[PDB]
């Protein structure tokens, strides 16, 4: 996270840390005791699926305070429409091997209904993005969980307000822009998979997933997030399914 602040311990209780052989991989969002939403691109380079760990209740990476809960990942579900090495359909649904225990430090974020997310949540201007990603473009990552408030843009406005690059990914209907074009604030590498959480009448909801962007806080650019509202039905159906051997599961989308 670039230009954010430390999320006070317990204020981002749905934040997940994903680890591969103990090393920082990506973020994620807890949506119930068993399920975590992350970005499909986080898993493009995974060789041994058994080395993937999800950590809940984490705050400061340099210390353990006993509020952390570690789980093995029993399943990584990715839409059939996602192509490794590309940006579209950047979502993954993770099944934890054993449920996490809900506590003051471990709470799921609400996965909203599609209609409510499209008709109401899509019009809330500001939403929170969080993670232990790079604090700066080409910089060191954060030791304490960071959080940033970002405004959402309509795709037409994002394209109008953005600098043209060339070989730049298209912003699809499965994405949205959020952030600032002045070089001050953005989500960054290592934040991928983490929540873009929207407040509405006292409750927080999952609206986006940190997905991609031109560098980090690059002048003339905005962060790009997976538009979670497009995947509600896909996610709900899979959460009702029985697990299958072999961690990686490609599931038809729609």
């Amino acid at each position: 996270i670039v230009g954010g602040k430390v999320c006070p311990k317990g204020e981002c209780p749905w934040q997940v840390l994903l680890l591969v052989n103990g090393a920082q991989l990506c973020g994620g969002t807890l949506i119930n005791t068993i399920w975590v939403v992350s970005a499909a691109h986080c898993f493009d380079k995974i060789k041994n699926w058994r080395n993937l760990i999800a950590v809940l209740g984490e705050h400061d990476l340099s210390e353990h305070d006993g509020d952390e809960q570690s789980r093995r990942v029993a399943q990584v579900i990715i839409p059939s429409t996602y192509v490794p090495g590309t940006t579209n359909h950047d979502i993954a649904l993770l099944r934890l091997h054993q449920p996490v225990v809900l506590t003051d430090h471990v709470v799921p974020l609400c996965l909203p209904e599609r209609t409510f997310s499209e008709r109401t949540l899509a019009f809330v201007r500001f939403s929170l993005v969080s993670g232990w990603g790079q604090l700066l473009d080409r910089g060191a990552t954060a030791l304490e969980l960071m959080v940033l408030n970002v405004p959402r843009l309509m795709t037409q406005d994002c394209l109008q307000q953005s600098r043209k690059v060339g070989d730049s990914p298209n912003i699809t209907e499965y994405m949205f822009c959020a952030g600032y074009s002045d070089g001050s604030k953005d989500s960054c590498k290592g934040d991928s998979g983490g929540p873009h959480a929207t407040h509405y009448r006292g409750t927080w909801y999952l609206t986006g997933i940190v997905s991609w962007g031109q560098g980090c806080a690059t002048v003339g650019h905005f962060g790009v997030y997976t538009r979670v509202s497009q995947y509600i039905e896909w996610l709900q159906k899979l959460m009702r399914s029985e697990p299958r051997p072999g961690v990686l599961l490609r599931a038809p989308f729609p």
Binding site: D104, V107, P108, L111, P112, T203
Partner: protein, 55 residues
């Protein structure tokens, strides 16, 4: 009704045949007698921050 101001619902909104509207709540919540508000039924409902809720 649901298209404008979330049909007055705190959470989920369902339009019906005619001028009828049903508000609904996520799991771990129940709809109050006002037919719009949602109150937690569990200790750890989704989307609420316990340390901030406990003040």
């Amino acid at each position: 009704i649901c298209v404008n101001e979330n049909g007055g619902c705190e959470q989920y909104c369902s339009d019906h045949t005619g001028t009828k509207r049903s508000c609904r709540c996520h799991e771990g919540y129940s709809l109050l007698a006002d037919g719009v508000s949602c109150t937690p039924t569990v200790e750890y409902p989704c989307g609420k921050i316990p340390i901030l809720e406990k003040r």
